[PDB]
Amino acid sequence: ASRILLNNGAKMPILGLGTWKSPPGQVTEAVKVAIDVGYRHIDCAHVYQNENEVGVAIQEKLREQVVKREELFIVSKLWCTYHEKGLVKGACQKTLSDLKLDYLDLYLIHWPTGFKPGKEFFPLDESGNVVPSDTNILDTWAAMEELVDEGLVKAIGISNFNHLQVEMILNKPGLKYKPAVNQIECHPYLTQEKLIQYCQSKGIVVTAYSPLGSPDRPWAKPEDPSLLEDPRIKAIAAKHNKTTAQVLIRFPMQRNLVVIPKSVTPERIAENFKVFDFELSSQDMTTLLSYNRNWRVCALLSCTSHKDYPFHEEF
Ligand SMILES: NC(=O)c1ccc[n+]([C@@H]2O[C@H](COP(=O)([O-])OP(=O)(O)OC[C@H]3O[C@@H](n4cnc5c(N)ncnc54)[C@H](OP(=O)(O)O)[C@@H]3O)[C@@H](O)[C@H]2O)c1
Numbered sequence: 316a317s318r319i320l321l322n323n324g325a326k327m328p329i330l331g332l333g334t335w336k337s338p339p340g341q342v343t344e345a346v347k348v349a350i351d352v353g354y355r356h357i358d359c360a361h362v363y364q365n366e367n368e369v370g371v372a373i374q375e376k377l378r379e380q381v382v383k384r385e386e387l388f389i390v391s392k393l394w395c396t397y398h399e400k401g402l403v404k405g406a407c408q409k410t411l412s413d414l415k416l417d418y419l420d421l422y423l424i425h426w427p428t429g430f431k432p433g434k435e436f437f438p439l440d441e442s443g444n445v446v447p448s449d450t451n452i453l454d455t456w457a458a459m460e461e462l463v464d465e466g467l468v469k470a471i472g473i474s475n476f477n478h479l480q481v482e483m484i485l486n487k488p489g490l491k492y493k494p495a496v497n498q499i500e501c502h503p504y505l506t507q508e509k510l511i512q513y514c515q516s517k518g519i520v521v522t523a524y525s526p527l528g529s530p531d532r533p534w535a536k537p538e539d540p541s542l543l544e545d546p547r548i549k550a551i552a553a554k555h556n557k558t559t560a561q562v563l564i565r566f567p568m569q570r571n572l573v574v575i576p577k578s579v580t581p582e583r584i585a586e587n588f589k590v591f592d593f594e595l596s597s598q599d600m601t602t603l604l605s606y607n608r609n610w611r612v613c614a615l616l617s618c619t620s621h622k623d624y625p626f627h628e629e630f
Pocket residue numbers: 332333334335336358359425474475498499523524525526527528529530531543558560561575576577578579580583584586587613
């Protein structure tokens with residue numbers, strides 16, 4: 316089907332629109348187009364600096380009665396400089412005000428690592444190290460549970476948490492709400508079989524980000540591999556008369572994942588949505604899995620000393 320059941324009882328569309336790097340002056344039309352062609356799930360974050368512009372689109376389509384609020388699945392994330400107990404609600408409310416919403420369908424802890432609070436998203440020390448905060452993921456989680464009890468968010472989850480970090484939450488003394496989602500990087504060069512099996516076995520839905528390999532990531536290098544240009548993946552697309560992006564989106568769907576491709580190009584927003592009329596074979600699926608190379612697009616050097624850095628752990 317087009318939605319997956321979460322452990323809070325709500326249904327989540329398995330295809331959503333990503334918004335990182337979408338320019339503020341193009342994202343409003345991108346989201347309007349996406350809602351017109353069928354998207355019902357938008358992935359957002361405060362740190363993306365465009366939630367106000369995303370919100371304008373949502374509100375105009377609610378106003379035009381193109382969609383009802385209950386049909387939408389809007390996701391945002393708590394940035395690293397707001398992990399303190401005291402700061403979490405205000406951060407949520409700023410995202411709700413920008414998005415012109417009175418609740419979120421899902422709010423995530425964006426990364427396991429807390430950073431010093433302040434105006435800078437990445438506060439650095441004089442030698443370029445991120446300055447941590449002395450907060451821990453368990454008290455931040457409790458702060459997230461309160462947002463559920465206050466009606467601000469319907470579900471809470473995590474992002475970029477490794478298996479020991481998910482387990483820390485699942486084992487939290489006094490845990491009130493389990494995380495509904497873990498949103499992680501996932502594509503054929505980073506297949507994440509171990510972390511996905513762990514999360515699914517715990518009834519945690521996995522959302523796959525950068526499913527096209529984030530070719531617009533700012534730190535991309537020409538020497539970097541390219542999923543969209545991999546002729547083996549092109550061949551599989553060509554077998555099904557689809558584009559490579561369409562194969563790349565359909566692949567996590569058939570692993571019972573949610574996937575959130577980003578685009579601000581209307582033709583591609585539409586193309587990326589036409590992934591419900593074809594299936595990859597089980598053989599196609601194992602072949603795509605075989606391209607794993609443990610290549611990660613999303614990390615940041617300056618954060619690697621943080622005690623809560625998620626990617627030293629194998630998974
Ligand atoms: N939780 C987190 O830490 C985290 C981290 C990274 C990403 N995310 C979320 O995941 C979303 C998707 O990840 P991403 O933005 O890193 O990258 P992505 O979706 O893997 O790739 C986006 C790039 O692909 C291009 N593209 C889209 N559709 C295409 C198509 N059909 N054919 C060819 N190129 C196409 C886009 O170009 P145009 O836009 O120019 O069309 C853009 O340059 C993000 O936007 C964000 O919402 C979350």
